[PDB]
Amino acid sequence: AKIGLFYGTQTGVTQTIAESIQQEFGGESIVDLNDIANADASDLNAYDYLIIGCPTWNVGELQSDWEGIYDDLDSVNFQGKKVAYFGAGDQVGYSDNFQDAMGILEEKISSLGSQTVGYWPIEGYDFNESKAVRNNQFVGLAIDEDNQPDLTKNRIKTWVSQLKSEFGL
Numbered sequence: 001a002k003i004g005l006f007y008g009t010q011t012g013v014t015q016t017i018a019e020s021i022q023q024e025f026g027g028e029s030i031v032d033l034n035d036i037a038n039a040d041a042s043d044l045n046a047y048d049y050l051i052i053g054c055p056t057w058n059v060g061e062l063q064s065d066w067e068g069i070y071d072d073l074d075s076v077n078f079q080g081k082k083v084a085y086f087g088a089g090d091q092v093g094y095s096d097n098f099q100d101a102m103g104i105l106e107e108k109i110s111s112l113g114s115q116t117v118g119y120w121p122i123e124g125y126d127f128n129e130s131k132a133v134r135n136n137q138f139v140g141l142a143i144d145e146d147n148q149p150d151l152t153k154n155r156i157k158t159w160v161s162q163l164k165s166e167f168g169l
């Protein structure tokens with residue numbers, strides 16, 4: 001209940017990742033798993049620590065459930081909150097828009113006064129452009145189940161270890 005993880009998913013990949021992240025943190029006593037499809041913008045208010053998960057769809061766009069709540073995000077005050085991000089994407093098929101959704105959400109939420117935590121290296125990927133890159137780092141964990149499924153488990157373990165420090169855990 002300390003950390004609220006909100007994800008959106010179209011073909012279920014982002015939900016599986018969300019479930020692995022909750023698992024690595026220690027389970028339901030540490031992280032609440034919430035499908036953004038069933039949530040209201042104000043649900044994000046109940047947490048001081050947030051994890052936002054979103055896959056990029058339709059060439060650089062938000063997954064539709066995140067799309068639907070996007071304009072309501074202005075009603076939440078993120079001042080003082082630490083927010084981490086993760087996303088699923090396909091670097092080979094969408095080289096010019098890899099993980100754009102994660103970047104779109106981070107730009108919106110950070111502008112509302114939150115603190116981004118959980119930066120990730122871009123070197124383990126091959127892509128041309130991404131809206132989720134700032135000063136040569138991803139603003140969150142990039143997962144690619146389409147082309148790099150073998151790296152997913154270690155990526156999540158490593159990222160969660162580094163987030164524990166950031167969330168005072």
Ligand SMILES: Cc1cc2nc3c(=O)[nH]c(=O)nc-3n(C[C@H](O)[C@H](O)[C@H](O)COP(=O)(O)O)c2cc1C
Pocket residue numbers: 008009010011012013014015055056057058059060061063088089090091094097098099100145146
């Ligand atoms: C129609 C379609 C469009 C996609 N567009 C993008 C894109 O613009 N950028 C990207 O990084 N991945 C893109 N992908 C890859 C998906 O984000 C990826 O398959 C992801 O695992 C889907 O997650 P989900 O199951 O949680 O919805 C696309 C996939 C499909 C089938």
